[PDB]
């Protein structure tokens with residue numbers, strides 16, 4: 001049916017979607033699926049030199065807190081997969097400058113504190129969503145950006161990465177490659193402790209299967225037999241964990257059949273800013289819920305039209321659209337003059353270097369030296385969160 005778009009050569013985001021496939025939900029809302037389970041997102045921050053063994057229920061004989069926290073982070077990463085990768089309508093392609101904010105109050109857990117979700121569409125050509133999720137009370141901070149490049153056989157490339165900070169401890173996370181939805185290739189979790197987790201996805205075997213191995217260092221990752229732990233199963237189901245070679249003492253690691261302890265708190269439409277997602281797409285979302293294809297086309301075209309004419313006003317003024325909470329930094333070796341450049345002790349560079357991960361705009365998970373890494377004129381612009389920009393915020397509230 002719609003497959004008649006296969007003849008097109010290039011990024012599908014250049015095309016336009018027929019109303020009958022549209023979801024009333026914008027892609028900027030999918031940012032929440034990085035911390036959908038508040039307790040798992042915060043767990044690592046509760047593990048310390050004095051309680052790691054009692055917190056590592058999967059292995060009360062864990063060697064160190066660094067390792068106990070890696071296990072919690074691994075469990076957390078697994079939990080984000082289902083809600084993110086589990087007819088089905090296509091989410092709306094966000095407009096440039098589109099915001100989505102919310103918060104998990106965690107009322108039944110005063111020790112959790114408030115966790116804030118900030119999400120912004122920092123690019124429309126091509127579509128790129130930046131995001132941040134932070135819990136000041138426990139010093140857990142997450143930031144990253146996402147980009148989906150669909151091309152035509154239907155290919156789907158994943159770009160970007162996510163960085164998690166548990167106090168003074170850092171974790172680099174790279175999204176998994178995929179295909180129409182099943183995951184493939186590898187995801188990486190590189191900690192500032194030297195610890196590395198390599199998640200290998202496979203389909204066909206059972207659906208949504210994966211193997212996750214934890215290594216003491218990136219040198220050990222070369223040989224799977226060196227793995228300290230081995231986790232296996234379905235990320236949409238259950239998975240087992242084996243320490244070293246103790247195949248006899250296999251354990252349940254994570255059970256994806258999990259109920260969210262809390263839903264994301266979003267303020268009512270009346271209080272929302274014209275830039276906030278649900279407020280801006282209000283009419284379209286309504287038409288979609290209604291089933292009126294012509295109303296969907298009308299309301300949507302008028303939003304895209306306003307956006308288009310808005311760009312024309314900027315182009316004819318020499319000025320451009322100012323991103324709100326995220327700034328684009330240049331990680332290339334020959335930065336353009338006047339470009340934003342990374343700090344001295346930049347976390348990304350440090351962790352990427354340990355993983356030997358490419359810092360270019362190659363598909364997520366690309367290692368230094370791969371075919372994609374050595375591609376001509378490849379840039380290295382990465383969106384970064386600026387906590388100050390949110391602190392200085394005057395209009396948007398939670």
Ligand SMILES: CCCCC/C=C\C/C=C\C/C=C\C/C=C\CCCC(=O)O[C@H](COC(=O)CCCCCCCCCCCCCCCC)COP(=O)(O)O[C@H]1[C@H](O)[C@@H](O)[C@H](OP(=O)(O)O)[C@@H](O)[C@H]1O
Pocket residue numbers: 005012013014015016017018021030084085087088089090091092093094124127146148149150156180181304307308
């Ligand atoms: C972290 C989140 C989870 C990861 C993502 C999950 C799955 C990804 C896997 C496969 C998805 C790939 C392909 C899906 C298969 C077929 C549909 C793609 C064909 C397609 O309509 O062209 C694209 C969307 O296309 C993607 O932007 C590429 C697709 C990106 C969207 C990803 C979600 C897709 C979910 C699968 C739903 C399949 C539904 C199809 C099956 C129906 C039963 C059209 O956008 P739209 O009309 O909404 O958006 C328009 C903009 O609003 C306008 O401003 C723009 O005007 P401009 O300003 O003048 O340029 C205009 O050109 C449009 O961009």
